[PDB]
Design an enzyme around this catalytic site. Structure first.
Site, PDB file in Angstrom:
ATOM      1  N   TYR A   1      -3.250   0.653  10.503  1.00 36.05           N
ATOM      2  CA  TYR A   1      -3.062   0.226   9.120  1.00 36.05           C
ATOM      3  C   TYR A   1      -1.663   0.576   8.624  1.00 36.05           C
ATOM      4  CZ  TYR A   1      -4.022  -0.534   4.177  1.00 36.05           C
ATOM      5  OH  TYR A   1      -3.999  -0.958   2.861  1.00 36.05           O
TER       6      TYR A   1
ATOM      7  N   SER B   1       0.882  -1.169   0.000  1.00 35.58           N
ATOM      8  CA  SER B   1       0.000   0.000   0.000  1.00 35.58           C
ATOM      9  C   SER B   1       0.916   1.215   0.000  1.00 35.58           C
ATOM     10  CB  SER B   1      -0.870   0.076   1.262  1.00 35.58           C
ATOM     11  OG  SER B   1      -1.589   1.313   1.314  1.00 35.58           O
TER      12      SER B   1
END
Lengths: 265, 268, 265, 268
Positions: free
Chosen positions: D155, D142
């Site tokens: 996250y 990501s």
């Protein structure tokens, strides 16, 4: 084929990785304009790829010669989709302490004019074409762009400089032209006129993959970035492509030599 | 006084961050030799610090001048402990498309000779002294050595090149001499460019640029260099890169800082 | 002294680097609250630094215990200027292939709860105090946060996770609290109950600096970041502090062993 | 067809980017085994690709389920060439101050078990097959594995952890198995979070986020994975990290892209 209809311009494409790239791109259905110094090697390359390559004799340090190359590509092939500034010279890994005082200035210019300025000029020359085609630039960097000991301070500085080009030009040319870098290393292989590792050690200490790939095995990353429809989200990307130099262990390059027996596989 | 007895040589030390470094190092008990092009400003710091700072007028692009600065430092203070190659010129953030075809080759040389070659020559000049003292090199980089939009391609490429010099010289000079980089940003120095090249003030874009939410005084950037000059504190550091830029590399998408609503959220 | 009047809270400060930091900070005129598990080692530390340290017995994995620590620091010293989340456990460099199937889940929790969650909770517990003082957080990372072979996949993942904490918390807590990371390595030195390099090789292949520093020599970077007036521009900063692990050469760690003779110096 | 004869196992392959990867890999001539929690969506891809895709319902957090997915892949297709640990859950970009004290410990476990441990277990499960085939692992990371403001601390910390897994596993699995990361961004997937956790759409902030100036379709992110799955093209790559995020890490200060005025500046 992966690159049918695509047009690329590759600087330093008459020999080395650049020639392997020319050959691969043509095999993939691309048309390729090459800027390089050797008239003879260029004519040889043109005949090897009849109709799918064009050779421009010139000096990668010269903006005017880079512009001649862009123009010739447009004249032969109608567009430029992917520019690959790739011509580079090495510095023999000559340490600062070993650079003589009376040659260091000249050497600085020689290596920086080729490795950095030639890249700046290539992009500059091709900018109208790349904006027109909404194309992309793929710089050849090096492991020397990220880690030490792949060259002296001169070569290492130039290749780190190219990482800067990737970043700044990805920014400057957005949203029209994408700009990424492939950083090959561990390949098979010339430095400036002012200047002048064993395989066992290479496999054990430097390269986790445990072998030195042939030049052709370094062409795939460039095909990826040049492929219509596969790299659209990528700009400012940096692909270390060097056999794992950056992820090598302390005492040995690889940690997994015993896995096949370890896993009974 | 954290640097008592130590000797530093600072290039570009007569103005901007370089002069702030000179004052801080003298304040910390170091003696400082400066290489700079401004004779007037070298005189100013010499008067300011008396015999604790000596200036040498010269061109950072010239190895000869770098050797003269080193020689002078040795004559004045007997050793060099920390070298701070710091002199740099900007490129007015001139975009590639905006670099004129008839100026681009000269501009390239001017900015690369100062920002990259002058760093190489400073280390070359000081290497014998630095190996003798088992000393340190602290390169001044920039946010432009890590991220775009802090200069044009010329400046950005030079400061990226300097990151390469940190890495390669940390390797080449070990185990004797430690080599690290400080990368200042948000300094608001008067970014001088080359004569060959003929934008938005920091204040005006602060909340898009600096998470710290304020514009540090120049003195605020000297502490990282003192740390690298302190032998008892920085001995394990080599090849390190310290971004010192108000958080430019950790800024958010919509605004630089994420904690505008923090204090109300926690009361007190 | 560098830190007169400053108040720091150090988790895992009863032994190892954390204790060296307590000792250094106190010597520098700081007041120090320590959260750790050992009641005995904490009382020993309190007596060593009478009036300048306070020990809180607790579990770094527990938010409630981190909050007890913040509260005790405030009660004893009136503020928290610098938080140093530092408690960590190792994984014996146990390779994925050597992690047994019946212990991997438990081990994951043990190491992640300490190395990552304990850091999250420390910052969470101290957030009111740090915003009030406009202070800062200095995470202890590791070379394992940047390179392989400083730990197994578990430890390496946790320390990379901490780099993420540096970045996200520098963002989230700006402009009120600064957040930076020191990544020590090459030091002198315990893993989870579910789980169970020669100096010559260390100096030759791993550490360019050519020696393993004493723990006290790793305390200076933390003093720097904790110093009132020296680190104001720094947030999201990452200081590799590991003897040059990231800049080591291919065949040898250092390239400059011969310099003294080479230069006739 | 670039992947004729190759076999991939993709976790979280029944929806989002994972499903786009399944379709692309089948389209390129690969056979694909999928581990996912959605039985319905696993049925959908099975019908779509006939015998060229087999689904297994399971929990990516469970090593047992990862081993069952591997076993199934072997039973169906006889080998595993490329493993794509891809299943991840988001954290709603919930800031630390906004993580409630009574939910934070559970949220931590939920997101770390999926995003980090499930990646570990997938490789663990497939290691014998991958060593046998001298295969590849392509981790989905990501932009949140490199830069802030792509998730909250939970996250962001998990995807940074995944960068660690690329590096450490590239080292541990060499010279037999290559391990690399693709780090997508700007995908606009429906970022599912944990039940324990109770923001601005991409379109609405595009010019602050993506230099490419457009929002790629999911299919546009599959090409990087095909490259890493292509043995003749990616043989030198291990430990590589490919940011694939529309240029998030090279975005400018005032606006993401620097070349708004480019085409007029060059005419044509």
């Amino acid at each position: 084929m992966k690159l049918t209809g695509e047009v690329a311009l590759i600087t330093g494409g008459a020999s080395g990785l650049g020639r392997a790239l020319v050959d691969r791109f043509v095999a993939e259905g691309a048309r390729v304009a090459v800027l390089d110094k050797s008239a003879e090697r260029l004519r040889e390359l043109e005949v090897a790829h009849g109709g799918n390559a064009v050779g421009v004799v010139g000096d990668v340090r010269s903006l005017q010669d880079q512009k001649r190359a862009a123009e010739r590509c447009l004249a032969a092939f109608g567009k430029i989709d992917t520019l690959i500034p790739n011509a580079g010279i090495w510095d023999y890994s000559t340490a600062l302490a070993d650079l003589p005082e009376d040659k260091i200035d000249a050497a600085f210019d020689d290596i920086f004019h080729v490795n950095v300025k030639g890249y700046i000029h290539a992009v500059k020359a091709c900018l109208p074409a790349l904006v027109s085609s909404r194309g992309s630039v793929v710089f050849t960097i090096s492991n020397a762009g990220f880690y030490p000991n792949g060259g002296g301070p001169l070569y290492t500085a130039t290749k780190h400089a190219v990482v800067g080009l990737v970043r700044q030009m990805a920014f400057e040319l957005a949203p029209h032209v994408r700009v990424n870098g492939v950083a090959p290393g561990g390949m098979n292989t010339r430095g400036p006129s002012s200047l002048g590792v064993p395989l066992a050690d290479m496999l054990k200490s430097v390269l986790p993959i445990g072998r030195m790939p042939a030049l052709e095995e370094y062409t795939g990353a460039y095909v990826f970035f040049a492929t219509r429809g596969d790299s659209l989200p990528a700009t400012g990307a940096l692909l270390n492509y060097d056999g794992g130099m950056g992820v090598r262990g302390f005492l040995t390059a690889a940690g997994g030599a015993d896995l096949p027996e370890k896993l009974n596989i």
